[PDB]
């Protein structure tokens, strides 16, 4: 009875989505000229990890960047001069995410230890020590992103998300609902809402203040590994293990466009937008990072040069460079 | 060209590079072992024998060889997403209990826990990330298994076994079935040793299997294979 009611309601939502859509985005954007060929040369090569890299995050000053490796190190890099700024030894070697604060005061990290560690960088003593330990997740930490210097949103392998207060140390908000492991999350610029994708092939939009799910986006065939907002905060792209990428609009609440090509059957590790949002960069398991034209659903460029599985990709705040990290222990900067 | 502060930053970067190189060499020497099995296998007991939330790291030194053993049993998350992290592992030690076949989980459909261990071993062994990784298989509770096979026949759980009641024949049949679960014999050796309450007997067998893996890796590095 209840299951039938749920099937009825979701059928009504599907019918509303069908009726609401009138003109395809590809048909409307067909008229505009394609961007062409975008070739990005390597500028800097970063070495010294000696293990596979899992996570990088750009700072808001567009110069420093943090990187997480499987030797138990967080390395904070000066991208212009190639010099290393910080080298933080970690308690747990296994790491799967690392967040760089917007102010730059703190660095978060997490992985298979079920702990989110907050490290202060502006200490008077001059040694980067463990400031905060956020114990309480039941599954592995998959992604974490700072909102301010006191509040952090984390996703975990117990199918939940959490909003934590750093100074108190307790979790202030818990988000439940996903049946599969939440693999990634992305923050909007206003930061009042955040979308997260899980291993149930769906993404959910969560309100930070209220604490409930505002919107639910389905359409993928496999586990969603990556998610990122469009720079206007009204849309977001998802990458999944089914060798496709999708674009979902929050207000439209439907699948705008799908990016895929026949030759590539491997999954999508990470995704990021350009400053204008015209280019969508995504690293795949084919040892390459493809730059897609967002409005034409066609390939605009290829970043080849990594010798192992590309694990992480980030476009900087002013859009002047893109940094890619891979399992070959090298960080590369493209421009 | 570069300012004095920039030169000092370069010197700091060089010192950090030296520290990272030393840490990388020290990590390179360390032998990593991944521990798997069921909850009732006896992981805590065997780890306490060898030594004397989330990931449980055990560090012990045998014959001037460093072993770090990662117990991942605590995590309840889906294994497929985080299994790829453990690709660079020397060996996987998989522990199961021989007395599991009589024990039956409290479910509506009565199922054999031994067959669940068989499915677990088949899933771990046939994983794409672990094709050249050796498996050290440990069979636990040998005395209780001998008493149980004396009291109760093995015909009741699965009918295929028709041999007379004997710990030797039945244990060898379970061992050969576990070896038959392997689908790539050429690129994966399986070391089966019956667990006993002796510190020397176990740790030495683990050291011998790790020694064989190091021999295989050195031969691949030289290029004979």
């Amino acid at each position, epitope marked *: 009875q209840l299951r039938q009611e749920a099937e009825q309601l979701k059928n009504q939502i599907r019918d509303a989505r069908k009726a609401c859509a009138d003109a395809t985005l590809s048909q409307i954007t067909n008229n505009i000229d394609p961007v062409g060929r975008i070739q990005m040369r390597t500028r800097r090569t970063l070495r010294g990890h000696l293990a596979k890299i899992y996570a990088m995050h750009w700072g808001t000053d567009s110069r420093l960047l943090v990187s997480a490796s499987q030797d138990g190190k967080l390395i904070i890099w000066d991208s212009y001069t190639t010099n290393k700024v910080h080298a933080i030894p970690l308690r747990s070697s296994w790491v799967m995410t690392c967040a760089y604060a917007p102010s730059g005061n703190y660095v978060a990290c997490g992985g298979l230890d079920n702990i989110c560690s907050i490290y202060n960088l502006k200490t008077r003593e001059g040694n980067v020590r463990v400031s905060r330990e956020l114990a309480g997740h039941t599954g592995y930490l998959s992604c974490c992103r700072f909102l301010d210097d006191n509040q952090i949103v984390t996703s975990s392998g117990d199918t939940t998300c959490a909003l934590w207060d750093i100074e108190t140390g307790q979790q202030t908000t818990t988000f439940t609902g996903h049946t599969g492991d939440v693999m990634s999350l992305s923050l909007a610029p206003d930061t009042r809402l955040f979308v997260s994708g899980a291993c149930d092939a769906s993404a959910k939009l969560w309100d930070v203040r209220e604490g409930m799910c505002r919107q639910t986006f389905t359409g993928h065939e496999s586990d969603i590994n990556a998610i990122c907002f469009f720079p206007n905060g009204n849309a977001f792209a998802t990458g999944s293990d089914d060798a496709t990428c999708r674009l979902f609009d929050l207000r439209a609440d439907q699948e705008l466009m799908t990016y895929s090509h026949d030759n590539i059957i491997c999954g999508i590790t990470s995704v990021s937008f350009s400053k204008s949002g015209r280019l969508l960069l995504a690293g795949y398991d084919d040892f390459n990072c493809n730059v897609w034209d967002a409005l034409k659903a066609d390939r605009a460029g290829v970043l080849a040069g990594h010798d192992n599985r590309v694990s992480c990709l980030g476009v900087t705040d002013d859009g002047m460079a893109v940094a890619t990290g891979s399992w070959d222990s090298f960080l590369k900067i493209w421009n | 060209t570069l300012s004095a502060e920039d030169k*000092a930053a370069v010197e700091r970067s060089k010192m950090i590079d030296r520290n990272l190189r030393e840490d990388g060499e020290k990590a390179a020497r360390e032998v990593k072992l991944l521990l798997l099995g069921a909850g009732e296998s006896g992981k805590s007991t065997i780890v306490k024998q060898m030594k004397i939330t989330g990931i449980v790291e055990t560090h012990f030194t045998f014959k001037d060889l460093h072993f770090k053993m990662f117990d991942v049993g605590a995590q309840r998350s889906e294994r497929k997403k985080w299994i790829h992290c453990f690709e660079g592992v020397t060996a996987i030690i998989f522990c199961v209990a021989l007395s599991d076949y009589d024990l039956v989980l409290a479910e509506d459909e009565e199922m054999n826990r031994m067959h669940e261990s068989m499915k677990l071993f088949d899933s771990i062994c046939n994983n794409k990330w672990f094709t050249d990784t050796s498996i050290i298989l440990f069979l636990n509770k040998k005395d209780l298994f001998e008493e149980k096979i004396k009291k109760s026949p093995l015909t009741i759980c699965y009918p295929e076994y028709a041999g007379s009641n004997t710990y030797e024949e039945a244990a060898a049949y379970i061992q050969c079935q576990f070896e038959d679960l392997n689908k790539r014999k050429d690129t994966k050796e399986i070391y089966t040793h019956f667990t006993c309450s002796t510190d020397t007997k176990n740790v030495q067998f683990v050291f011998d299997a790790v020694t064989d893996v190091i021999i295989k890796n050195n031969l691949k590095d030289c290029g004979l294979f």
Partner: single-chain antibody
Amino acid sequence: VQLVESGGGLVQPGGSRKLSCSASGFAFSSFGMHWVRQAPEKGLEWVAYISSGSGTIYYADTVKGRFTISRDDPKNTLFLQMTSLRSEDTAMYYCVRSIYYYGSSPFDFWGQGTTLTVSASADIVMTQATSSVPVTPGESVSISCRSSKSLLHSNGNTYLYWFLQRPGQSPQLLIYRMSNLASGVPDRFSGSGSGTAFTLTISRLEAEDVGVYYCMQHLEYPLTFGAGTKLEL
């Protein structure tokens, strides 16, 4: 964070003396170290620098060959061996910790000073044009400094540091790289200007700000200080 110096007292000319500075409550091995001298009724003067890990060592030319700096990291101690002292060395010596990376604040923490008495590339010349300005609490005060060489480097940083020495206390850093305020300094101070012409503006003058203000270049060794503008009431 604490630095205390020992080895003071009177010394005969032509003798030898070893000073030692002990550091507590911070990672001594990661900081470079400075010795800075102060004449009794004159400005400050830089003596020497040792990097972290002892990889590079710098000396002033007046003290080149006579003074030997060293550090012991397991005991967290800095040593200065002084041979063949002269009548100009009757000065108070401060130890300074400094860390160098992108965004760092070097010269932030100053020692307490050990007094020693023995008798009772083109050098960038830093020029404090004024010497004393009488001020009243409340008005905004401007202090001018000038250089002999353009301190604007090609990376975009201008290496000018502003220091305040209170009467009878250790000097503190106010401004590093002419724009950023040092950690623990109120927002009353602001630095502005360009190459060869620099200005410190103190809006809403408040008590305990009376002291001597120093402008320092940090473009190339040897470090050369300013004369020192004093304020009074």
